[PDB]
């Protein structure tokens, strides 16, 4: 109580001294002020004097004396621990001044500056905007060339705070070469706090369409994959969210073998967010990349994805990408046939067929239909799929989707194409054909021969083709009036549809 009282007349007095034109006086006052800022009572008198804080700030950014620059920046850092200190700093032009001190050749000054700014960025309203306007972004990205990891942790977090929800900042960070610098940090250092603060910046940048390609080009996928089994769950989860955001743009990368293997193992995690991300990342990385498909199947990806689906239940945020990954893994690569069989061996057929029913929504249903189309390529799955009731439900989905397309005023055309395509493959089996026909499907299939969509015509012709290999069926198709529309599909620019059209015609005699 007597210290605070003393502080009240010492502050106005030191304010006069800081404003003196004699640098010797200035420098000496800076020292006392710094020392006073270390004690609460006097620190309070400092933060509560607009002229005192303005003098500290001005002295700091204008002195040519290292000790003064250190003492003033240290005073400001000390004031930043309190709400009123943070406010006074902001109101006294401290932000532009602190951003300038980031260029200081003196570590101690630079450290005081970045730390004071971090406190402002965290707790002072208006500080994020002020730093962006003062060119703080470009300077912080440039400082990523430093090697003190604690310094780097604070600096990367400053960039995270500034970039979050702010597209402009993200573009500037990209402009300054931020992605390459941040990926380099992830590849190099082992300090957990820095790996974590850095992964959050990458996470924030990964949602921006311009930053994704850059991060991926800088080798970000592989670097993030290096920390997926770290004991720090916050580091792992952040690397996972980032990897998932970047994944749709990394389907052409190499050196992904380790990453893919680790993701397959993470599918067995008891952490919902770990599993969700792993499934999503894997779905995207297996899209049109036969090397990744081979890798994922090789390490037991199929069994892991099926278990993921079984454990997931009706959680579509897990099942949709898991089912999409399984679809990608059951076609167009050396081990697709083995993959189609593995789904059955690990009890995936019943759940796969189950996913065609409510509460499943259209996105999931579409992916599931696609997977079934691929699974049906394996003869050993024909009977199991039938026994599970795939045919009745696919037919039902097809009927409903078709009727919706026929109304004037996920697109249902896709459901029509998919369901008919699945029935097409399933029709390769004699017993399935009986069931198919038994559902009064022939009339609908013929009607689809008139579809304006080529892909639809193809699958319509395809299933009729398979069905027509049985005489009683072929005759039924002919009676239904398929000849005319079939005859017309011979002049299609799609030799596939033409081939099937020819076949149905041929078989009908």
């Amino acid at each position: 109580q007597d210290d605070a009282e003393l502080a009240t007349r010492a502050i106005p007095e030191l304010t006069k001294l800081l404003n003196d034109e004699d640098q010797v006086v200035v420098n000496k006052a800076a020292v006392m002020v710094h020392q006073l800022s270390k004690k609460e009572a006097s620190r309070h008198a400092i933060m509560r004097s607009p002229q005192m804080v303005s003098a500290i700030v001005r002295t700091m950014q204008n002195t040519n004396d290292v000790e003064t620059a250190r003492c003033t920046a240290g005073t400001l850092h000390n004031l930043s621990h309190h709400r009123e200190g943070l406010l006074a700093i902001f109101k006294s032009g401290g932000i532009p001044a602190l951003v300038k001190m980031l260029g200081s050749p003196v570590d101690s000054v630079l450290f005081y500056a970045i730390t004071t700014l971090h406190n402002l960025l965290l707790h002072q309203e208006g500080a994020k905007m002020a730093v962006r306007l003062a060119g703080g972004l470009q300077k912080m990205v440039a400082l990523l060339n430093k090697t003190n990891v604690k310094f780097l942790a604070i600096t990367t977090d400053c960039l995270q705070i500034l970039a979050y929800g702010n597209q402009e900042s993200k573009l500037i960070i990209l402009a300054s070469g931020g992605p390459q610098a941040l990926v380099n940090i992830m590849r190099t250092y082992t300090y957990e706090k820095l790996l974590w603060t850095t992964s959050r910046v990458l996470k924030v940048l990964s949602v921006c369409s311009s930053n994704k390609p850059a991060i991926v080009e800088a080798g970000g996928m592989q670097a993030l994959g290096l920390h997926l089994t770290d004991p720090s769950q916050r580091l792992v989860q952040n690397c996972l969210w980032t990897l998932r955001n970047l994944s749709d743009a990394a389907t052409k990368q190499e050196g992904m073998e380790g990453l893919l293997g680790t993701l397959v193992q993470l599918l067995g995690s008891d952490d919902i967010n770990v599993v969700t991300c792993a499934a999503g990342i894997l779905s995207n990385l297996t899209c049109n990349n036969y090397k990744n498909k081979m890798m994922v199947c090789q390490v037991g990806g199929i069994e892991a994805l099926v278990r993921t689906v079984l454990r997931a239940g009706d959680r579509e945020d897990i099942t949709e990408p898991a089912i999409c990954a399984l679809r990608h893994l059951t076609s167009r690569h050396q081990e697709a046939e083995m993959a189609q069989n593995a789904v059955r061996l690990h009890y995936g057929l019943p759940v796969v067929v189950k996913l065609l029913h409510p509460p499943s929504h259209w996105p999931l249903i579409k992916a599931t239909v696609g997977l079934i189309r691929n699974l049906a390529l394996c003869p050993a799955n024909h009977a199991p799929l039938r026994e599970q009731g795939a045919i009745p439900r696919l037919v039902q989905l097809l009927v409903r989707a078709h009727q919706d397309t026929q109304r004037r005023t996920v697109r249902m055309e896709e459901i029509v194409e998919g369901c008919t395509g699945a029935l097409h493959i399933l029709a390769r089996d004699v017993h399935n054909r009986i069931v198919i026909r038994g559902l009064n499907t022939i009339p609908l299939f013929v009607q689809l021969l008139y579809s304006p969509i080529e892909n639809i015509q193809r699958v319509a012709a395809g299933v009729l083709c398979e069905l027509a290999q049985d005489k009683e069926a072929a005759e039924a198709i002919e009676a239904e009036g398929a000849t005319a529309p079939l005859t017309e599909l011979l002049h299609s620019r799609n030799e596939g549809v033409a081939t099937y059209a020819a076949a149905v015609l041929f078989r009908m005699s």
Partner: protein, 60 residues
């Protein structure tokens, strides 16, 4: 979605450019931006400072 009589028919059933196509899912989860509040950290002499500091030197 992202794209890639008997004998001839076999060429049809085995065409790679036919659906279904593999597809991409564009995720863009940015998070919540929680605070990193646990990062690690980075007057007798007045009597000998002259007239300019007399006032202070006296009170301290």
């Amino acid at each position: 979605d992202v794209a890639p009589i008997d004998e001839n028919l076999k060429a049809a059933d085995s065409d790679p450019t036919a659906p279904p196509y593999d597809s991409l899912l564009v995720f863009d989860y940015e998070g919540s931006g929680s605070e990193a509040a646990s990062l690690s950290s980075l007057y007798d002499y007045l009597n000998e400072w002259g007239n300019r500091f007399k006032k202070l030197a006296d009170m301290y």
